[PDB]
Amino acid sequence: SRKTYTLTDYLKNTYRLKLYSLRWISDHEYLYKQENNILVFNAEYGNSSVFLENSTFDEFGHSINDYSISPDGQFILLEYNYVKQWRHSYTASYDIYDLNKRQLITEERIPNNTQWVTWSPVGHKLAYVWNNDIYVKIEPNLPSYRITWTGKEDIIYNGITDWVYEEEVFSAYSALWWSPNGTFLAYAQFNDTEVPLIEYSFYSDESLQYPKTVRVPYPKAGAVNPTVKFFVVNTDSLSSVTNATSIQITAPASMLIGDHYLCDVTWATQERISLQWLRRIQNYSVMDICDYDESSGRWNCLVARQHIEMSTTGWVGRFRPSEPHFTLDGNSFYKIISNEEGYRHICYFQIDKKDCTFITKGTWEVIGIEALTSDYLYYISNEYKGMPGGRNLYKIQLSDYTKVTCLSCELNPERCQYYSVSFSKEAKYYQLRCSGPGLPLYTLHSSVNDKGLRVLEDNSALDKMLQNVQMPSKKLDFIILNETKFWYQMILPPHFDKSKKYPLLLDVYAGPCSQKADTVFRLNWATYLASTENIIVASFDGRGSGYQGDKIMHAINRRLGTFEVEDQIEAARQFSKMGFVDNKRIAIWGWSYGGYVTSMVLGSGSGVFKCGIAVAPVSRWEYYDSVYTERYMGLPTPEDNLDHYRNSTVMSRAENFKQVEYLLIHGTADDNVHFQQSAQISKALVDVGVDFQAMWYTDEDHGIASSTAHQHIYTHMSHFIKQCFS
Amino acid sequence: SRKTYTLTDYLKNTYRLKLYSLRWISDHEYLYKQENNILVFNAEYGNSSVFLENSTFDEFGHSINDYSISPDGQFILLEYNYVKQWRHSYTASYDIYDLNKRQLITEERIPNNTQWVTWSPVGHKLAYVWNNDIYVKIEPNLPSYRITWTGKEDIIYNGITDWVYEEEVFSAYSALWWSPNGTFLAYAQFNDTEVPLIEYSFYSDESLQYPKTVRVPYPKAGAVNPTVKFFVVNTDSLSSVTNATSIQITAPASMLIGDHYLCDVTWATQERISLQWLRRIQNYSVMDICDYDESSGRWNCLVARQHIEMSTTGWVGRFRPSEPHFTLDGNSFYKIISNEEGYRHICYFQIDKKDCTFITKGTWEVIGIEALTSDYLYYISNEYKGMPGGRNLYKIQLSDYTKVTCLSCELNPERCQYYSVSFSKEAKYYQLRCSGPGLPLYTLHSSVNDKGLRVLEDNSALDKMLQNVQMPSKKLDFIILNETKFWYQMILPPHFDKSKKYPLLLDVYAGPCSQKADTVFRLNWATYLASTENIIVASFDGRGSGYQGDKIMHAINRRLGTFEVEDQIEAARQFSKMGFVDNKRIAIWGWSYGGYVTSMVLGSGSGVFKCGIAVAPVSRWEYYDSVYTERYMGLPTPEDNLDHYRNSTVMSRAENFKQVEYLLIHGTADDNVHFQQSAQISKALVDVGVDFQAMWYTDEDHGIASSTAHQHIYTHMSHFIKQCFSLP
């Protein structure tokens, strides 16, 4: 009947999920970057107008890949010469189009090679980084004010993060934050003077005669971390003769005793700012609440006004301490923190009360706080049906915590069990985004009465199209391991027959606070394997897994590469003894942390798996960056946790690879998990006389996402898997 | 009943070839290292006598990897802490043991990390290189004298070569030459200031947190080459001046006009040195003969004493200008040069007479000159039977070139057709080393009448073992293409049956002046593929191959990656016509230059090969070094030969790789054929969506000779080959 979902389909992306990306520009309108031009929509009625034609820039002379309109509506930042860097960062050329005079600004324009550009929240002000220094433009065409002069390549970063702050702590490239009305510009400074450098070769195009060596400050476990400083500058009080005067906010003293990190910065009001700090030992963090002193020009952070957040079972926050959400007057706030019982719920704070009040509770967790109004607190949780792989929008009455309403649960329970949301400026409206188990569904609503205004994108096209191909199904369920229940999912081949026996591929990640079992709808490699190759692709969340409380998550604290790997074995072990699983054909593969787990499992000696593929895996924790590693592993010193660091490497298990077919893959330009990791694995197998399969991808990074590489790695992996299974 | 030669046998070295390594200390004796006891032998009778006994260096705490006794026999240099570098260079620690008093010298020892050491050719003087500077010791226990101060890491090398000079010009690491007497010390100095650095990562042991970046000054095609200067210093003045001045010998003007290389330096007499030079365009070479001026204290090189050697069809010499061999008085010498017919023969030169006289025959070539006495001149050649893959020792009478005698041809014509030789200090005795087609045979002879004195090693031990195993055979014949014969080699499976069709693997190298078809007896991977997997392993020496004249060798001049490649394919066709080859199971593999040729063939689109393996191949000539590459390709510039440098890359044929199974292997620490080359090959196949097998070897260089790595690569290649042939 019909045809199946083939590898080509997946690689050639013949079945496209339609999206609806909007950007609210007020509490009543949003922008919708269509394909050619850009449109503005009226949330209330749905009518729209073109904001600016596509052709407006035909003879611009460059290809534009991003339009950033100032909150004014008077200017447009044009982004071109897009040269990607790490996960978030990138360099590019910029130009500003003045909408009033309908002309491109030609004087004092933004320097080529600019690292970052950001508009003030309200005006048309501009802060941008160039050569590691901050610059402010009060007017799009006027000269630029040098806010900082200490910028030095690979040494000092002003306004931007260094490799590790970008990937591990902020999860963003920018290191500057404007105050709500644009008066103040807060920023951080990173000194990487003593941070060791990671060096690897980049070959570039065939034409390059000599390979060049890329070197970037990257602290590995236990290495020397970059130090940081925080400053606040007044952007309404700068001359042009006198250099800008930035006031530094330091401490806390409890933090200054040893190494630490600047975790988060949030503006409570026009003159209050809160900064969360965390010790290198991500066990104890402090939040500071500083106020601007009018006739003093300094920022004071009164003690007693600070709040301490610590963990006795693990680390603070899922990956970092949570974002605080301040009330209108900035005198109180809400943030997600861990329960006494270890579950994540919303706590209510009083800037001067050392204790907060949980407004939500129960054995499920609040994913995130999405919107706050004097009226309600909007948030997402996996409380519905008690299934942690489901996400729904909720709103709790700030006057009566008893009046909690689920906004997405009942809209379409069959097709929707996983949501994300986007509120307008004042939360008058909100777009709901459903991504499973059925096809993605985008809808628009008004918060006054949770009226369902209209359907934005229903993927009706894709639906009609997919009903013509034998698509696989997905089963979410759980098993019980001595008391606790752990969820798992299984992509089942079309016309699945519980009577027949199918080979099984264990798709794993299992990093601390991860979830590979959910209700999201995906079109990926697994889809093809099941649809075309009739292979069952299963994923399992065991110890270390997230959104199920700290008892589960923190289970692997200071002990990576133990329970999560073992639970993965136990699971596959139970899957085989299920009847429809051919135990002679069970494989495993993972990418990144999942490459690590996969490699550790294959070298466990369980004998459960016939073959496995590891892509860009971690081989020994001392090779990964400090921030992420120390969080779960502590320091690699004999006084702390060195022993486990040494007992949890992949190479130590080399000898057990003798009983399995292993495929090791890794990009040569991986700036995240250095090629070093896989090179030490391959060398260890060679030392032990174990044969295996290998494949490197020159100049590819952790995502091995280049168009050609992508199709090539998935093609190679397919052969490997069906060769092992057939 | 009777087992075969297995991969494990090969990998574990079950069946070992015995050797007999000598070290002539005089004209009558030689030292033989018996692993625990090094004894001195008397060529005349066969005496023994321990020279340095079993337990003489215990309580040393350090293992000695090699020794080296001083010419006057009074001392012995103990080498330990060996740490390899490139093909010849290496670092090590040293200690000098005094024999005149069985004591171990502890005063003014030689520095650790010493890059190189050599005794004077007479007596007990020492000259070593440390931190790129030259040092000299008159007495082993006395403080040395520094002779150079310009030593600088990766920039200025004194007494030692840089990377390219070590691998492509001298084929030696050392760059200093004591005069025969030991009075003068000549050395070269290299300046690599402007030479680009090749850079790659070195991961080291697992305990290393951050990878290391090895960077070696290495000139790729057309890049900036190092510059050179030649100096000579008088070591007998060291104890009278304080800072002995190093006299420099420059020019020739015909060389100074552009980039050039110092090729060879050999002492003619007590105060006469000959220096060979070559332009970067390796078609013009010049030899200078300089004499010490006991009045000026300088060294002059009379122009009437200068010799020009230029080639019109290719480069000069096989891999470099020929080496000169002077007569006692240094007034005449012998060099190997190609005659007008294009064959390499020995011709006689008079230092002050521009034209030389050829003393050897015609259609075959002299491989090298081995010894020179007042009576005769000994040389090795492939004249016998007219087979270039054969090798024999001959001696020609100096007073009458019509009197030529083959000292090895007939010793054992059935078992020995490839010899190498090692004469004594005065050529009074000489050891013959037979390499095939039979088992290695080492014998000792006296020059008076050339009679065998005795057999030093007959491998009868190994012979006894190999008879109890189904060994494979070797067919060494030839084929004629375009009325000119090219020799081939075939390692046939036991009980070969011309009726039954056999799978075939083409073992290739095919580089400029090479020989893959010979008479040498080998115990390698091929012995396994034939003995056990019943696979015919063949080799073919087509255009570009050497020892058969410049007509054949220079065929691929400025055309690298052409005929050499097409011939290799034709040979496969020719082999198929023979009738005992399975057309649908023909594979091809090669390492180094063979990897390159192998890839080019795989990307040819001539559906003759099913699969192929390339170990550490060259992908595009602009990636290889200048000295080797330019010698055959000229400059990679639009004026010169750029067009072909680009027309001969492996990546330009990525597309065709869809019709063959490819396995690309390469070591990441390869300082010769950089990983970059295979990195660009993988990247190109990926760009065109062609699948292939791959394997990298962490921290392995061009040899991939690490004990464990070596086993791993051959195990990995074996699976690929038998899978491709559908055995197992």
Ligand SMILES: *[C@@H]1O[C@H](CO)[C@@H](O[C@@H]2O[C@H](CO)[C@@H](O[C@@H]3O[C@H](CO)[C@@H](O)[C@H](O)[C@@H]3O)[C@H](O)[C@H]2NC(C)=O)[C@H](O)[C@H]1NC(C)=O
């Ligand atoms: C090795 O070769 C390099 C060149 O490849 C030699 O270095 C060059 O030496 C000259 C003279 O010693 C330098 O010129 C001087 O520059 C200084 C500073 O600009 C100036 O004050 C002097 O008047 C003079 O012009 C030249 O800069 C330098 N080039 C480089 C790239 O370093 C070097 O001397 C050679 N070493 C040996 C031992 O032969």
Ligand SMILES: *[C@@H]1O[C@H](CO)[C@@H](O[C@@H]2O[C@H](CO)[C@@H](O[C@@H]3O[C@H](CO)[C@@H](O)[C@H](O)[C@@H]3O)[C@H](O)[C@H]2NC(C)=O)[C@H](O)[C@H]1NC(C)=O
């Ligand atoms: C033994 O003699 C050699 C050569 O005569 C000495 O080396 C020479 O030393 C000088 C100074 O150390 C080197 O540099 C010169 O320095 C001046 C100072 O400013 C500078 O203006 C000149 O341009 C020049 O660079 C000189 O290049 C160097 N020559 C050589 C061939 O190495 C050596 O120092 C003497 N050893 C002892 C222990 O006296």
Ligand SMILES: *[C@@H]1O[C@H](CO)[C@@H](O[C@H]2O[C@H](CO)[C@@H](O[C@H]3O[C@H](CO)[C@@H](O)[C@H](O)[C@@H]3O)[C@H](O)[C@H]2NC(C)=O)[C@H](O)[C@H]1NC(C)=O
């Ligand atoms: C960025 O961070 C640097 C250190 O992390 C600041 O600097 C300091 O560090 C250097 C060394 O890293 C100190 O010492 C220098 O001189 C001594 C003298 O021998 C050397 O031993 C040492 O290796 C250094 O060369 C400096 O003394 C120290 N402070 C100062 C003021 O020099 C650096 O100031 C900082 N930059 C910014 C903009 O914050």
Ligand SMILES: *[C@@H]1O[C@H](CO[C@@H]2O[C@@H](C)[C@@H](O)[C@@H](O)[C@@H]2O)[C@@H](O[C@H]2O[C@H](CO)[C@@H](O)[C@H](O)[C@H]2NC(C)=O)[C@H](O)[C@H]1NC(C)=O
């Ligand atoms: C969308 O159209 C809006 C006008 O639409 C009419 O009036 C509405 C109140 C409603 O009854 C609808 O059904 C009618 O067709 C228009 O609204 C207003 O906002 C603009 C400024 O943005 C203002 O200039 C205009 O006068 C207003 N109109 C009214 C009658 O209130 C709105 O501009 C438009 N939005 C877009 C993006 O096209």
Ligand SMILES: *[C@H]1O[C@H](CO[C@@H]2O[C@@H](C)[C@@H](O)[C@@H](O)[C@@H]2O)[C@@H](O[C@@H]2O[C@H](CO)[C@@H](O)[C@H](O)[C@H]2NC(C)=O)[C@H](O)[C@H]1NC(C)=O
């Ligand atoms: C950023 O650079 C571009 C391109 O010019 C660069 O700088 C030149 C000095 C030269 O080194 C080029 O190779 C560089 O690419 C500037 O755009 C102008 O583009 C025109 C058309 O190609 C060219 O003729 C001009 O030389 C370029 N610049 C100037 C000053 O003439 C662009 O102005 C630079 N951006 C900023 C804000 O300085």
Ligand SMILES: *[C@@H]1O[C@H](CO)[C@@H](O[C@@H]2O[C@H](CO)[C@@H](O)[C@H](O)[C@H]2NC(C)=O)[C@H](O)[C@H]1NC(C)=O
């Ligand atoms: C703004 O402060 C910076 C501080 O560095 C000044 O810039 C430097 O000034 C010194 C003079 O002491 C110069 O030698 C440097 O070349 C300048 N550049 C840099 C990047 O350091 C600058 O002069 C100050 N501006 C004013 C108006 O005071």
Ligand SMILES: *[C@@H]1O[C@H](CO)[C@@H](O[C@@H]2O[C@H](CO)[C@@H](O)[C@H](O)[C@H]2NC(C)=O)[C@H](O)[C@H]1NC(C)=O
């Ligand atoms: C943005 O907020 C700032 C800070 O609250 C406002 O600036 C202050 O304005 C008051 C009077 O309204 C002055 O007395 C202070 O001196 C200002 N503070 C500073 C540090 O300059 C500003 O008015 C707000 N902007 C708008 C448009 O309301």
Ligand SMILES: *[C@@H]1O[C@H](CO)[C@@H](O[C@@H]2O[C@H](CO)[C@@H](O)[C@H](O)[C@H]2NC(C)=O)[C@H](O)[C@H]1NC(C)=O
């Ligand atoms: C946070 O973790 C640290 C250790 O990483 C705990 O402090 C002590 O650290 C030393 C050295 O590693 C250990 O020997 C102790 O067992 C740790 N605890 C104590 C009580 O000394 C620290 O206790 C942790 N913080 C919290 C709040 O649990």
Ligand SMILES: *[C@H]1O[C@H](CO)[C@@H](O[C@@H]2O[C@H](CO)[C@@H](O)[C@H](O)[C@H]2NC(C)=O)[C@H](O)[C@H]1NC(C)=O
């Ligand atoms: C061998 O070395 C030299 C090579 O000529 C011999 O010659 C002497 O060289 C020095 C210069 O270093 C001159 O001053 C002498 O005049 C040369 N000697 C004669 C006899 O002319 C040297 O004599 C020999 N040395 C040894 C140890 O044999």
Ligand SMILES: *[C@H]1O[C@H](CO)[C@@H](O[C@H]2O[C@H](CO)[C@@H](O)[C@H](O)[C@H]2NC(C)=O)[C@H](O)[C@H]1NC(C)=O
């Ligand atoms: C050696 O080869 C070079 C090639 O580099 C020849 O040099 C150039 O000049 C010649 C004139 O004498 C031309 O005829 C060559 O074509 C030219 N070669 C190139 C590539 O530019 C040189 O002639 C040769 N020398 C001898 C003795 O044959």
Ligand SMILES: *[C@@H]1O[C@H](CO[C@@H]2O[C@@H](C)[C@@H](O)[C@@H](O)[C@@H]2O)[C@@H](O)[C@H](O)[C@H]1NC(C)=O
């Ligand atoms: C070897 O023996 C020499 C003497 O050998 C004897 O005399 C000679 C003339 C022959 O007749 C021989 O057969 C006799 O055995 C010694 O002079 C010499 O030093 C010895 N050399 C060694 C290395 O032991």
Ligand SMILES: *[C@@H]1O[C@H](CO)[C@@H](O)[C@H](O)[C@H]1NC(C)=O
């Ligand atoms: C309980 O389950 C955990 C998680 O799988 C497992 O590690 C353990 O062996 C079981 N028993 C005990 C006593 O922990």
Ligand SMILES: *[C@@H]1O[C@H](CO)[C@@H](O)[C@H](O)[C@H]1NC(C)=O
């Ligand atoms: C070489 O090193 C050893 C120990 O590392 C030391 O004992 C010896 O003295 C050193 N030699 C010199 C000349 O410094």
Ligand SMILES: *[C@@H]1O[C@H](CO)[C@@H](O)[C@H](O)[C@H]1NC(C)=O
């Ligand atoms: C004829 O020429 C050569 C010999 O010079 C021979 O090897 C080749 O096969 C023939 N020509 C071609 C185009 O191959």
Ligand SMILES: CC(C)[C@H](N)C(=O)N1CCCC1
């Ligand atoms: C998952 C993400 C937060 C993380 N920084 C990461 O890149 N991982 C790569 C494998 C080990 C850590």
Ligand SMILES: CC(C)[C@H](N)C(=O)N1CCCC1
């Ligand atoms: C063969 C040798 C003289 C040479 N240096 C070499 O390493 N080759 C490697 C393949 C291309 C050149």
